[PDB]
Amino acid sequence: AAEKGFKQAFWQPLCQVSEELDDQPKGALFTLQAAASKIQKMRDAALRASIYAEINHGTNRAKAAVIVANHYAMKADSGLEALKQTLSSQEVTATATASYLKGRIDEYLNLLLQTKESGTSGCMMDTSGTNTVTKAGGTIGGVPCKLQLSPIQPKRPAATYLGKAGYVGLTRQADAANNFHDNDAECRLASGHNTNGLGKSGQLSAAVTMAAGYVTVANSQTAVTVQALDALQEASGAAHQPWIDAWKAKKALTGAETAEFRNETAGIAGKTGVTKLVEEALLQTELKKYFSGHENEQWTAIEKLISEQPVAQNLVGDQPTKLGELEGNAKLTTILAYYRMETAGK
Amino acid sequence: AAEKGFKQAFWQPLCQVSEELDDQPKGALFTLQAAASKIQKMRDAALRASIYAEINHGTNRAKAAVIVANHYAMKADSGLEALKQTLSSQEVTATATASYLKGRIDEYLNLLLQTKESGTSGCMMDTSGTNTVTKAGGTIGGVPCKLQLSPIQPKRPAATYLGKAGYVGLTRQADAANNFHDNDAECRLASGHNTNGLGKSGQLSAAVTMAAGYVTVANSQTAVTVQALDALQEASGAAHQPWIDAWKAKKALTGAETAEFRNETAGIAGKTGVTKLVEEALELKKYFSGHENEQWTAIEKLISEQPVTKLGELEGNAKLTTILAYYRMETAGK
Numbered sequence: 232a233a234e235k236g237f238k239q240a241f242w243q244p245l246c247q248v249s250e251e252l253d254d255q256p257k258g259a260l261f262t263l264q265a266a267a268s269k270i271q272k273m274r275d276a277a278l279r280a281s282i283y284a285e286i287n288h289g290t291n292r293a294k295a296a297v298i299v300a301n302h303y304a305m306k307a308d309s310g311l312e313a314l315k316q317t318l319s320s321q322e323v324t325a326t327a328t329a330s331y332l333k334g335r336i337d338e339y340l341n342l343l344l345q346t347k348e349s350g351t352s353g354c355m356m357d358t359s360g361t362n363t364v365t366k367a368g369g370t371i372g373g374v375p376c377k378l379q380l381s382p383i384q385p386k387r388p389a390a391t392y393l394g395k396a397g398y399v400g401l402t403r404q405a406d407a408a409n410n411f412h413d414n415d416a417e418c419r420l421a422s423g424h425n426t427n428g429l430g431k432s433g434q435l436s437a438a439v440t441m442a443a444g445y446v447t448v449a450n451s452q453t454a455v456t457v458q459a460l461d462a463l464q465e466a467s468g469a470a471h472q473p474w475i476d477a478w479k480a481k482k483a484l485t486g487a488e489t490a491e492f493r494n495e496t497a498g499i500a501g502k503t504g505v506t507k508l509v510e511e512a513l514l515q516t517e518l519k520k521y522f523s524g525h526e527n528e529q530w531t532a533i534e535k536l537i538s539e540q541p542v543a544q545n546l547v548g549d550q551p552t553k554l555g556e557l558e559g560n561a562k563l564t565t566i567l568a569y570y571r572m573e574t575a576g577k
Numbered sequence: 578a579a580e581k582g583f584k585q586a587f588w589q590p591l592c593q594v595s596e597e598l599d600d601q602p603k604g605a606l607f608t609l610q611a612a613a614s615k616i617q618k619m620r621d622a623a624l625r626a627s628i629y630a631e632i633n634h635g636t637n638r639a640k641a642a643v644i645v646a647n648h649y650a651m652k653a654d655s656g657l658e659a660l661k662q663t664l665s666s667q668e669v670t671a672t673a674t675a676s677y678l679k680g681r682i683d684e685y686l687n688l689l690l691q692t693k694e695s696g697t698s699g700c701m702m703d704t705s706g707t708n709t710v711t712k713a714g715g716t717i718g719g720v721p722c723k724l725q726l727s728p729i730q731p732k733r734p735a736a737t738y739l740g741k742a743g744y745v746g747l748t749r750q751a752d753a754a755n756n757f758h759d760n761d762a763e764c765r766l767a768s769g770h771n772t773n774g775l776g777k778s779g780q781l782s783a784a785v786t787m788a789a790g791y792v793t794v795a796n797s798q799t800a801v802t803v804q805a806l807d808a809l810q811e812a813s814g815a816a817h818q819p820w821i822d823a824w825k826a827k828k829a830l831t832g833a834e835t836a837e838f839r840n841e842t843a844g845i846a847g848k849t850g851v852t853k854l855v856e857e858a859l860e861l862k863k864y865f866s867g868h869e870n871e872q873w874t875a876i877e878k879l880i881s882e883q884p885v886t887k888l889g890e891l892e893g894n895a896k897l898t899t900i901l902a903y904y905r906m907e908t909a910g911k
C-alpha cells in the first residue's frame with residue numbers, strides 16, 4: 232500500500248548494485264597493474280632480443296634480433312604512453328563515479344535500514360513484508376549488502392549488475408504499491424505527505440528524489456516511482472545523473488587490451504617499427520637476408536633462437552641461464568649492460 | 578531548538594568537505610600521469626646514453642655511457658614497478674575513499690535540501706534560520722556546494738578542509754540546539770521521535786546516524802550530536818569509518834616523489850645499478866675521471882651535446898628507440 236515500508240523487492244536490487252560498485256576500484260587497480268605487466272613483458276622481450284644481438288654481434292641473426300628488439304621496445308613505449316594518456320583517466324574516472332554512486336546508494340540504504348520502530352514496522356522490510364531486516368556482518372536480511380567500501384585489492388573487472396546497456400536489475404516497475412510497498416509497515420521516508428510521511432505541519436513542497444535520483448517520493452499519499460535504468464543513453468543534468476555517469480565511465484573502459492598492449496600477428500613488414508628501421512638503417516629484400524623470410528613464421532623462429540640463448544652463468548644465481556627462462560626488466564637490463572661492456576672492449 | 582531544521586553553521590562545513598573531496602580523483606589522475614611522464618624522461622636519458630655509447634663504441638667515455646644508460650634504464654624500470662605496485666594502489670584508494678565519502682555526504686545534504694514545506698520551513702536553512710536555501714548552479718544559499726562529482730581533469734587538490742590532522746571544520750559542537758538547529762523550521766529528519774521527527778506510531782527503535790556516521794539523530798526530543806573529526810586517529814569499526822578511510826588515504830599520498838621517479842645526487846658508486854655493474858663487468862676514474870656527482874654530470878653533458886641536432890634536444894621514447902636501433906645496426910656493421 233502507498234506510504235508503507237519497502238519490501239526486499241525494492242532494496243535488494245540496490246544492494247546488488249552497491250556490492251558491484253564496490254569492486255570497481257578493485258578492477259581499476261587490476262587494470263592499471265595488468266597494463267603495467269604487459270608493458271614489462273614487452274620490455275623483457277626487447278631486452279632478450281638486444282642481449283641476443285650483443286652476444287651474437289656481427290651475424291645476420293643478430294641483425295634480425297636488433298629489429299625484434301626495436302619492435303618490442305616500441306611496443307613497451309606505446310603501452311606506457313597509452314597508460315599515461317588514456318588508461319589512467321579511464322580507470323580513475325570509473326573508480327570515482329562508481330564509488331560516488333555507491334556512496335549515494337549506501338547512505339540511502341543505511342537510512343532505510345535504521346528507520347524503524349519495531350521488529351515488524353519500519354522502512355526496510357523482508358521479502359514478504361513480515362519483519363524489518365537487520366544487518367549482520369556484510370549481509371542485510373541474508374542479502375550481501377555491506378554498505379561500506381571494502382579494502383581495495385586487485386580483482387578482475389566484472390560487469391554483471393551494471394553492464395553495457397545499464398543496470399540490468401533496475402527495470403521499470405508497474406505496480407510499486409503492491410511490489411515495493413508493504414501492507415502495514417510504517418515508514419515516513421516512503422512519502423512526502425504529513426500524515427504518514429516526511430511532512431510535518433503539511434505536505435512537502437514537492438516530490439523528493441533519493442538514492443541519486445533513483446526513487447521519486449511524491450508529496451501525496453501515492454506509491455513511489457523508480458527510474459528504469461536498464462537501457463541507458465547519455466544524459467546531462469538528470470535527477471539520476473550519478474547513475475548515468477558510472478554507467479558511461481564503466482562502458483568506456485577498454486582494459487589493458489588495446490593494440491598497444493597486444494602482440495602483433497601481421498607479417499614482419501607490418502610489425503611496429505620494422506619498415507622504418509629497415510629503411511633508415513639498411514637502405515622485403517633486406518628482410519629475407521636476416522629472417523630468411525618475411526612472415527610471422529620466420530619471426531617466431533628468431534624469437535625461438537633468442538629464447539633458447541644461454542647467458543654467462545656468473546650473471547645469474549647458482550638459476551637457469553637461457554634468456555627465455557629469465558624475466559624482470561631490471562634483471563635483464565643489467566645483463567644487457569654486461570654484454571654491452573663486453574662489446575665495447577672489442 | 579531541538580527537532581528543527583538545520584542552519585547553515587551545520588551544513589556549510591559538510592559542503593566544504595564535499596567540495597574538497599571532489600578534487601581527490603583529480604589529484605590521482607595528476608599523480609598517475611606525472612609518474613608515467615617521469616618514467617618516460619628516465620627512459621629518454623637511458624636511450625640518449627646508449628646512443629652515445631653506440632656512436633663512440635670503443636672509448637672509455639662510451640663505457641661510462643654504458644654505466645649511465647644502465648642507471649637510467651633501471652630507474653625507468655623501477656619507476657614502472659612503483660607506479661604498478663605503490664602509486665596505483667595509493668591513488669585508486671584515495672579516489673575511491675574520497676568519492677565514496679563524498680557520495681555519503683552529498684546524499685544526506687541532497688535530502689536536507691529537498692525536505693521542506695515552504696520558503697521558511699524545512700531541513701536546510703540559511704545562516705539565521707530565516708529561509709530554506711535553494712540550489713543554483715554549484716552553490717546552495719551562496720555556499721559552494723555542487724552535490725555532484727565534477728568532470729575529472731588533472732588537478733592538485735586543496736588540503737584546507739581535509740588535512741593531515743583530520744577535518745578541520747568538523748569540530749565538537751557544544752550547543753547544537755541553538756547553533757545547529759533553527760528555532761522554528763520544521764524538519765522530520767532532525768529527530769527520531771514521532772511528534773516532530775521520523776517516528777510514526779512511536780519513536781524510532783534507535784538513534785539514527787547519517788552522513789556516514791557524522792551526525793547522530795536521537796529518538797528522543799533532543800538536539801543532534803556530531804562527531805568531532807578534526808583530530809583523527811587510525812581506527813577500524815568506527816561508526817564514522819568512511820571519514821577515517823578518506824583521511825588516511827589522502828594523508829598517505831606521496832605523489833610521484835618517491836626515489837624511483839627521482840634522479841640521484843649520490844656519488845657514482847652509490848647510484849642505482851652502478852656497483853653491481855662495475856663488479857660483474859669490470860675503477861670509475863677510468864671512465865668518469867672521478868667518482869663524485871660532478872664527474873657524472875660531466876659525462877651527461879657529453880651525452881647531451883652529442884650530435885646525431887643534439888641528443889639533449891631530442892625527446893620521446895619511441896623516437897629515441899628507433900635512433901638507437903639505427904646505431905645498433907651501424908655497430909652490427911663492424
Ligand SMILES: *[C@@H]1O[C@H](CO)[C@@H](O[C@@H]2O[C@H](CO)[C@@H](O[C@@H]3O[C@H](CO[C@H]4O[C@H](CO)[C@@H](O)[C@H](O)[C@@H]4O)[C@@H](O)[C@H](O)[C@@H]3O)[C@H](O)[C@H]2NC(C)=O)[C@H](O)[C@H]1NC(C)=O
Pocket residue numbers: 614615616618619621622623625626838839840877878880881887888889890892
Ligand atoms: C634525470 O636527469 C637527467 C639529466 O639531467 C635528465 O635528462 C636530461 O633531460 C633534460 C631535459 O629533457 C635534457 O636537457 C636538455 O638539454 C638540451 C641541450 O641543452 C644544451 O644545448 C642547448 C641548445 O644548444 C642550450 O640551450 C643549453 O643551454 C645546453 O647548452 C636543451 O636544449 C633542452 O632544453 C634540455 O635542457 C638533458 O640533455 C637530459 N640529459 C640526459 C643525460 O639525457 C632526466 O630527464 C632526469 N629524469 C627525470 C625523471 O626528470
Ligand SMILES: *[C@@H]1O[C@H](CO)[C@@H](O[C@@H]2O[C@H](CO)[C@@H](O[C@@H]3O[C@H](CO)[C@@H](O)[C@H](O)[C@@H]3O)[C@H](O)[C@H]2NC(C)=O)[C@H](O)[C@H]1NC(C)=O
Pocket residue numbers: 268269270272273275276277279280492493494534535537538554555556
Ligand atoms: C609478446 O610476445 C613475446 C613472444 O614473441 C613474449 O615474450 C615471450 O614471453 C614468453 C613467456 O614469458 C617466453 O616464453 C619462454 O619460452 C621458453 C622456451 O623454452 C620457456 O621455457 C619459458 O618458460 C617461457 O615460456 C619467451 O621467451 C618470450 N619471447 C621473447 C622473444 O622474449 C611477450 O611476453 C609478449 N607480450 C605480452 C604482453 O604478452
Ligand SMILES: [Ca+2]
Pocket residue numbers: 359360361413414415416
Ligand atoms: Ca506487513
Ligand SMILES: [Ca+2]
Pocket residue numbers: 705706707759760761762
Ligand atoms: Ca527560524
